[PDB]
Amino acid sequence: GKSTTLFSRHTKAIVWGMQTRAVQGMLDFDYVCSRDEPSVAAMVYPFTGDHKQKFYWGHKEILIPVFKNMADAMRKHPEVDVLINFASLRSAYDSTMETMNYAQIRTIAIIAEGIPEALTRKLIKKADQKGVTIIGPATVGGIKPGCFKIGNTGGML
Amino acid sequence: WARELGLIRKPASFMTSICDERGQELIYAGMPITEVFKEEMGIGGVLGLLWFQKRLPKYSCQFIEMCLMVTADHGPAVSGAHNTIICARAGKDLVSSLTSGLLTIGDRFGGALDAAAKMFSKAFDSGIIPMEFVNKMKKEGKLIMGIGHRVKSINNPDMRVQILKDYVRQHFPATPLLDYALEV
Amino acid sequence: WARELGLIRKPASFMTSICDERGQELIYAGMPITEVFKEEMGIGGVLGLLWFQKRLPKYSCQFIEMCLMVTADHGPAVSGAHNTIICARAGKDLVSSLTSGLLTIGDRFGGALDAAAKMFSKAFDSGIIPMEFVNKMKKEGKLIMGIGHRVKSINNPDMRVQILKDYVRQHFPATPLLDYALEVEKITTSKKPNLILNVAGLIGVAFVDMLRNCGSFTREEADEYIDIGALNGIFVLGRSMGFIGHYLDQKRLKQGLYRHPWDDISYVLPEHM
Amino acid sequence: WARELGLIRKPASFMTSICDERGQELIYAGMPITEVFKEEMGIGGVLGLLWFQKRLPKYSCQFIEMCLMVTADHGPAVSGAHNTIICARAGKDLVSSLTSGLLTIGDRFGGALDAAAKMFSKAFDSGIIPMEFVNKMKKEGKLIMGIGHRVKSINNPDMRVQILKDYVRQHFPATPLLDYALEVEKITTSKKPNLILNVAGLIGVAFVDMLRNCGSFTREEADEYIDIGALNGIFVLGRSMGFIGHYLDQKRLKQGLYRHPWDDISYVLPEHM
Amino acid sequence: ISGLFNFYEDLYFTYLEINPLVVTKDGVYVLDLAAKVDATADYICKVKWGDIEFPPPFGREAYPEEAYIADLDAKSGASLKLTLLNPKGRIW
Numbered sequence: 001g002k003s004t005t006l007f008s009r010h011t012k013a014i015v016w017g018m019q020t021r022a023v024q025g026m027l028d029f030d031y032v033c034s035r036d037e038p039s040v041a042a043m044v045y046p047f048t049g050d051h052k053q054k055f056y057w058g059h060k061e062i063l064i065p066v067f068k069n070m071a072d073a074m075r076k077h078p079e080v081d082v083l084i085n086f087a088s089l090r091s092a093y094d095s096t097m098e099t100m101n102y103a104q105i106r107t108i109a110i111i112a113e114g115i116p117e118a119l120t121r122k123l124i125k126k127a128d129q130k131g132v133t134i135i136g137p138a139t140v141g142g143i144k145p146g147c148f149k150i151g152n153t154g155g156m157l
Numbered sequence: 158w159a160r161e162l163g164l165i166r167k168p169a170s171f172m173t174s175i176c177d178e179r180g181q182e183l184i185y186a187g188m189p190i191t192e193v194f195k196e197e198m199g200i201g202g203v204l205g206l207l208w209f210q211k212r213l214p215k216y217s218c219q220f221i222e223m224c225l226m227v228t229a230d231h232g233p234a235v236s237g238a239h240n241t242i243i244c245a246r247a248g249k250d251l252v253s254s255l256t257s258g259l260l261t262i263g264d265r266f267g268g269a270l271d272a273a274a275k276m277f278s279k280a281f282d283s284g285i286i287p288m289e290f291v292n293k294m295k296k297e298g299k300l301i302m303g304i305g306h307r308v309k310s311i312n313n314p315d316m317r318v319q320i321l322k323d324y325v326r327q328h329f330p331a332t333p334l335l336d337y338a339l340e341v
Numbered sequence: 342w343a344r345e346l347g348l349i350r351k352p353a354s355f356m357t358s359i360c361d362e363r364g365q366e367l368i369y370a371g372m373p374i375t376e377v378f379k380e381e382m383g384i385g386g387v388l389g390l391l392w393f394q395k396r397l398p399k400y401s402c403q404f405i406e407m408c409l410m411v412t413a414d415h416g417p418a419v420s421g422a423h424n425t426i427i428c429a430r431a432g433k434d435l436v437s438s439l440t441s442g443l444l445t446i447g448d449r450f451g452g453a454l455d456a457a458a459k460m461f462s463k464a465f466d467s468g469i470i471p472m473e474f475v476n477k478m479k480k481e482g483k484l485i486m487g488i489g490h491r492v493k494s495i496n497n498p499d500m501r502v503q504i505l506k507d508y509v510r511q512h513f514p515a516t517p518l519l520d521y522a523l524e525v526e527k528i529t530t531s532k533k534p535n536l537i538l539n540v541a542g543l544i545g546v547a548f549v550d551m552l553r554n555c556g557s558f559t560r561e562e563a564d565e566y567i568d569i570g571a572l573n574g575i576f577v578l579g580r581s582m583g584f585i586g587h588y589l590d591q592k593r594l595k596q597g598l599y600r601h602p603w604d605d606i607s608y609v610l611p612e613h614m
Numbered sequence: 615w616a617r618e619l620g621l622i623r624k625p626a627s628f629m630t631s632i633c634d635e636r637g638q639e640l641i642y643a644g645m646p647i648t649e650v651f652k653e654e655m656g657i658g659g660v661l662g663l664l665w666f667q668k669r670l671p672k673y674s675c676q677f678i679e680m681c682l683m684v685t686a687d688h689g690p691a692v693s694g695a696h697n698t699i700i701c702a703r704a705g706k707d708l709v710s711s712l713t714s715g716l717l718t719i720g721d722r723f724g725g726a727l728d729a730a731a732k733m734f735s736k737a738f739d740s741g742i743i744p745m746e747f748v749n750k751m752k753k754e755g756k757l758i759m760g761i762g763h764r765v766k767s768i769n770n771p772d773m774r775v776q777i778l779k780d781y782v783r784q785h786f787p788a789t790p791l792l793d794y795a796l797e798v799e800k801i802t803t804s805k806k807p808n809l810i811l812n813v814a815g816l817i818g819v820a821f822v823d824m825l826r827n828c829g830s831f832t833r834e835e836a837d838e839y840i841d842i843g844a845l846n847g848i849f850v851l852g853r854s855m856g857f858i859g860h861y862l863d864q865k866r867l868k869q870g871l872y873r874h875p876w877d878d879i880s881y882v883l884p885e886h887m
Numbered sequence: 888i889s890g891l892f893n894f895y896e897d898l899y900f901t902y903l904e905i906n907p908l909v910v911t912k913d914g915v916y917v918l919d920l921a922a923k924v925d926a927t928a929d930y931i932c933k934v935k936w937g938d939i940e941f942p943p944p945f946g947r948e949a950y951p952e953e954a955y956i957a958d959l960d961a962k963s964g965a966s967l968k969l970t971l972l973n974p975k976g977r978i979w
């Protein structure tokens with residue numbers, strides 16, 4: 001079933017794609033919201049090997065893991081309940097189908113604009129079956145002040 | 158003196174086929190140096206002789222020279238130029254500094270020419286069409302080598318891709334792999 | 342001054358974890374240099390700190406030093422020493438000559454340590470018995486790396502394989518891969534006497550055994566250090582002593598510029614290109 | 615077959631005196647490898663054999679090992695370590711990366727050991743007193759090599775100059791050049807506190823003292839070994855450990871390709887050439 | 888018999904005579920058997936043979952030097968044979 005609360009101060013998200021500016025904006029928002037931990041636990045980028053990307057937690061320097069595969073990212077981070085999908089329109093459908101095979105993910109944000117409507121309807125049907133809330137495609141996302149920010153929502157700091 | 162008399166046998170430990178220093182005239186792969194200058198080949202023709210032991214056509218030598226010209230430098234920020242500058246500022250040496258910079262040439266820096274040639278040749282020889290090649294690279298988690306620019310795009314061309322592409326179009330007899338890469 | 346006030350953010354472009362130059366005392370992987378000398382580690386302990394960021398046990402450091410000692414030189418005929426001598430006789434430079442020799446270190450020369458470690462580790466971890474490993478290498482058209490000697494055989498031992506093997510037997514807690522390689526060597530010497538465990542084979546398998554049997558590393562760390570080329574580093578650091586010795590030898594002997602005789606070169610140029 | 619019968623004459627194009635690979639046992643400068651390990655020389659004794667063809671006393675070999683230990687690394691900011699890290703982040707190779715770093719070793723980086731040894735030896739052999747040497751260097755527009763530290767001074771000692779100096783004082787029979795350099799350091803620290811004997815200065819003068827005060831060398835041999843660059847070899851061999859450590863560190867951290875930021879480069883190209 | 892043949896050709900026997908083989912309603916019994924095996928097949932059957940021994944022909948005891956020569960024969964691919972009839976002879 002689709003939950004009532006999507007985001008909290010302990011919400012951890014996986015970001016699909018290499019979006020370092022968006023992730024840094026997410027982290028800056030988390031810091032100025034006095035969150036204990038960053039809201040991004042891992043990133044998934046299929047065109048590279050697993051490594052660690054250097055980000056900022058306020059003025060401190062932190063490392064966020066980047067995984068080639070969804071499976072490794074979800075294995076190493078069972079506390080992640082949100083996926084922010086920066087896949088293009090050609091990859092978003094497959095990324096989201098693959099994401100909904102992991103029950104830990106309860107909310108998916110799809111950023112890409114231009115996904116065909118039939119593919120979106122298939123996504124909607126599977127999400128309804130799995131009880132996964134989808135912040136529909138062609139969106140900047142959403143913001144929960146004090147708790148969580150989706151991608152580039154709200155602009156810069 | 159025993160070798161001159163042909164009285165003993167000693168196998169030669171080295172083989173070479175590109176240059177003949179001994180003799181009255183220097184020879185570049187069967188071609189005397191005077192003939193090299195009379196035939197008016199330049200760096201490209203000499204490179205053809207020394208690297209391939211072939212007398213390349215004039216447009217091939219010109220294209221090789223053009224390739225050398227466009228890859229001559231790309232600023233001081235890249236790894237090899239950075240290392241060469243560091244070594245020069247260590248007061249070191251021309252050979253030492255150039256070598257320090259050259260030892261960075263490999264996969265991540267300076268290897269995109271070889272990687273792109275190999276990738277496109279493999280795709281072209283396998284018989285797959287460009288769309289199939291793009292999809293196959295995508296699902297293998299591999300970016301296409303030789304595709305992509307930081308700032309320049311369609312309607313904002315590289316302008317040294319343009320120079321080489323214009324030359325190849327006008328002078329090469331056939332460019333099948335170039336056509337394949339343009340479809341990609 | 343803006344950084345001191347903490348008014349700006351600038352990401353650091355470099356990461357490092359082996360040495361801390363800044364500060365009152367030099368630090369080798371979290372260990373002060375005064376403590377490095379007080380604890381009486383030598384080259385082996387310093388190498389453990391700088392290459393693995395670990396405080397290795399004393400027998401591990403001693404074994405590393407022994408490995409450096411046995412690979413220090415193997416005469417002037419090999420490719421790297423030959424190149425170093427040529428460069429020294431060109432009047433060139435210590436760094437230039439040593440580097441010219443070191444650039445030959447790779448697959449065919451100086452890479453047998455890494456190749457043997459990888460081959461034997463793969464066979465051991467796959468679970469196949471030594472006879473199956475020998476047969477599998479045979480039908481793949483591959484010689485076992487680290488097996489075979491030009492002159493020395495069973496009943497005529499290498500005697501620097503013997504030194505390292507005796508040390509490893511007496512001081513290592515467990516040597517599973519060394520035992521596996523010794524079984525493989527029993528089979529190969531049954532085929533013909535000179536197919537003994539090499540210095541390269543023994544050093545490779547004993548280094549894998551040291552990495553994954555001393556308590557400092559997890560299996561993943563030991564495998565990663567084998568993968569990224571720590572044994573290549575062992576050979577390079579060991580053979581650098583010999584290459585520098587060859588450079589100094591050529592300088593002391595005042596050997597002039599070398600030219601290869603034409604009678605040793607077969608010229609097979611094309612007729613007319 | 616003609617050579618075996620002694621029927622022909624062919625001059626050998628190469629000469630070597632440091633290692634004998636052929637034969638039943640490997641020989642390091644006339645000493646079998648088994649005897650090298652039985653006599654319990656370590657890296658220092660092997661280095662003495664391979665670089666000087668001498669059986670050095672135990673304190674000499676220990677001092678050589680200490681010198682290798684203190685020059686093993688000095689962090690990632692120096693030119694050689696920087697180049698090695700760049701080459702490792704280019705995904706390149708252990709040998710290629712280490713060589714890229716080593717090719718910066720020369721005058722401005724890593725040459726202070728040799729320069730200090732030569733300067734202090736020249737001053738000591740000319741017979742001038744330390745005050746005369748300081749004044750002579752001053753009016754020649756030359757800074758004394760081996761004198762000077764960035765932060766450390768008298769009452770704040772280098773602490774790896776201290777380790778080596780204590781060892782040399784306790785074990786060397788005579789240290790005339792070290793005493794001369796300490797007098798020079800007294801003068802220079804009278805000028806300002808941080809003008810202390812460097813690690814380079816101490817290693818250079820103590821190496822000259824070891825060469826010409828241990829019994830293995832004549833004065834001519836010691837001078838020749840200083841002249842042909844044995845201290846360059848000491849620094850190169852020591853710093854190779856740190857450069858390999860930096861390569862392995864960058865591989866373990868999976869650091870990607872480095873590009874120097876444009877904001878750190880001043881472009882001063884001509885208007886139109 | 889069929890099984891015996893499979894025993895004969897799997898262990899590389901060249902001679903195998905089980906005589907007499909007494910068979911009764913209780914079962915089969917091998918009272919005696921003389922067997923010669925192909926020694927060169929050791930590399931195929933060392934697992935199945937175990938530490939198989941080949942007794943010398945019944946007669947004079949083998950000399951320690953003759954056993955030394957036999958041991959030498961296994962050192963390499965060379966052939967190293969020695970046999971004695973009377974060490975008190977002068978023709979050697």
Ligand SMILES: CC(C)(COP(=O)(O)OP(=O)(O)OC[C@H]1O[C@@H](n2cnc3c(N)ncnc32)[C@H](O)[C@@H]1OP(=O)(O)O)[C@@H](O)C(=O)NCCC(=O)NCCS
Nearest residue numbers: 234269300301302303304305306307308873874875876877
């Ligand atoms: C070619 C390829 C690397 C393009 O990468 P990219 O991420 O689009 O661009 P870059 O990696 O150059 O860097 C992006 C930004 O860094 C900037 N930059 C480049 N060098 C810089 C330097 N030394 N200092 C500061 N900034 C720099 C660029 O101007 C660019 O600025 P922008 O963010 O305003 O656009 C990518 O398409 C690719 O990997 N292709 C695979 C094929 C290949 O490798 N080809 C080899 C190229 S010859």
Ligand SMILES: CC(C)(COP(=O)(O)OP(=O)(O)OC[C@H]1O[C@@H](n2cnc3c(N)ncnc32)[C@H](O)[C@@H]1OP(=O)(O)O)[C@@H](O)C(=O)NCCC(=O)NCCS
Nearest residue numbers: 177178179180181597598599600601602603604605606627
């Ligand atoms: C240039 C210079 C070295 C000429 O030297 P040279 O002693 O007259 O001749 P080389 O040393 O080249 O060769 C001597 C002999 O060895 C032979 N030889 C050359 N290379 C050989 C090789 N690889 N194998 C076998 N024999 C060789 C030559 O054919 C020559 O044969 P010869 O004895 O029948 O005449 C000398 O004049 C000189 O030192 N000049 C100073 C200026 C300078 O150095 N110029 C640089 C030259 S670009």
